[PDB]
Amino acid sequence: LPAERNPLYKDDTLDHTPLIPKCRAQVIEFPDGPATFVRLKCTNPESKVPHFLMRMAKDSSISATSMFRSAFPKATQEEEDLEMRWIRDNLNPIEDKRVAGLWVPPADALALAKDYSMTPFINALLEASST
């Protein structure tokens, strides 16, 4: 697992609460029906490259793929697949063929957030309302 992690997650001390509001809800129409997502724009303060972390409204599946691509910006395609396939072999990801990436329940998301030094951003995501 990379350790060149994004400087926005330097301090893991931060109180999660100020980040709750800048989460935004967005509905996307799928063939099986509309689905609600909660996003939180996270910006690399040095490169100023932004990324969303997203959470499905129903059952709170958080995209582990987006967490990873936000935590370690200089990651490689192989660095992704190692930590990705490590989640299939060590965590309980969901199986949703209609979305891209790997999505995990809140237990697995709060774990990876300690791995990634970004739990302040994930409780914010898990605690924001989809109205």
Side-chain angles (χ1 to χ4, degrees), residues 6-10 12-96 98-113:
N6 165 48
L8 174 80
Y9 317 116
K10 178 96 143 79
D12 197 279
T13 163
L14 212 257
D15 44 331
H16 81 271
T17 84
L19 297 168
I20 292 196
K22 46 183 66 174
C23 297
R24 303 279 154 101
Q26 175 74 41
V27 181
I28 298 178
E29 186 71 26
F30 288 103
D32 71 340
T36 312
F37 295 85
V38 191
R39 305 197 180 112
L40 165 59
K41 191 186 199 180
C42 304
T43 305
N44 186 320
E46 289 175 32
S47 74
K48 314 240 159 167
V49 162
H51 276 283
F52 294 118
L53 319 172
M54 50 265 198
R55 164 182 74 84
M56 309 198 320
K58 286 199 40 129
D59 308 335
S60 281
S61 311
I62 297 196
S63 171
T65 308
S66 65
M67 281 173 70
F68 177 87
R69 296 175 177 178
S70 179
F72 326 110
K74 300 138 44 190
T76 47
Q77 223 294 319
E78 319 73 347
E79 265 176 316
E80 197 182 281
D81 301 13
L82 157 65
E83 186 66 8
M84 283 305 114
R85 187 63 186 260
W86 177 87
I87 293 169
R88 290 152 122 166
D89 309 347
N90 298 74
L91 292 151
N92 301 89
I94 82 181
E95 196 198 23
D96 200 7
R98 68 202 168 119
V99 290
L102 205 68
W103 301 69
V104 310
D108 305 346
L110 286 175
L112 294 161

Side-chain angles (χ1 to χ4, degrees), residues 16 20 62 110 113 118-128:
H16 81 271
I20 292 196
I62 297 196
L110 286 175
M118 60 180 312
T119 79
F121 294 86
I122 298 276
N123 318 108
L125 189 57
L126 286 166
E127 289 163 29

